């Protein structure tokens, strides 16, 4: 498996799963979030200030479902 790694653009929607995130900075991009188990979870969408990365593939960032359909 691989890691997404996408750099967030100013104003890009970011996705966090409150159930599976190891800490509050753990964030997924749109196309990963919708191809993962976390869409049926308690989640939150916030706008990125720019920078940071999509945490898809980072196994230590998630308690469950560290990968989406694209990256697994
Ligand atoms: Zn991503
Ligand atoms: Zn992904
Ligand atoms: Zn989740």
Beta strand spans in the chain (E): 13-17, 43-47
Q: Is 40 annotated as a binding residue?
A: no
What is the count of structural domains for the chain? 1
Resolution of this deposited model, Å: 2.6
Q: According to the 3-state scheme, what is the secondary structure of the chain? A: CCCCCCECCCCCEEEEECCCECCCCCCECHHHHCCCHHHHCCEEEEECCCCCECCCCCCCCECCCCCCCCCC
Tell whether the torsion through CA atoms of 11, 17, 18 and 22 is positive or negative.
Answer: negative
Q: Torsions phi, psi of 16, nearest 5? A: -125, 135
Instruction: Report the distance separating Cα 1 and Cα 9, nearest Å.
Output: 25
Instruction: Report the distance separating Cα 59 and Cα 22, nearest Å.
Output: 10
C-alpha 20 – ligand 1 centre gap (Å) = 16
Enclosing domain of residue 43:
4-72
C-alpha 9 – ligand 3 centre gap (Å) = 23
Instruction: Report the distance separating Cα 10 and Cα 43, nearest Å.
Output: 21
C-alpha 40 – ligand 3 centre gap (Å) = 7
């Amino acid at each position: 498996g691989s890691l997404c790694g996408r750099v967030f653009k100013v104003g890009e929607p970011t996705y966090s799963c409150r159930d599976c995130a190891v800490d509050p900075t753990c964030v997924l991009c749109m196309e990963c979030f919708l191809g993962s188990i976390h869409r049926d979870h308690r989640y939150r969408m916030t706008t990125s200030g720019g920078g940071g990365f999509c945490d898809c593939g980072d196994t230590e960032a998630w308690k469950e479902g560290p990968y989406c359909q694209k990256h697994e």
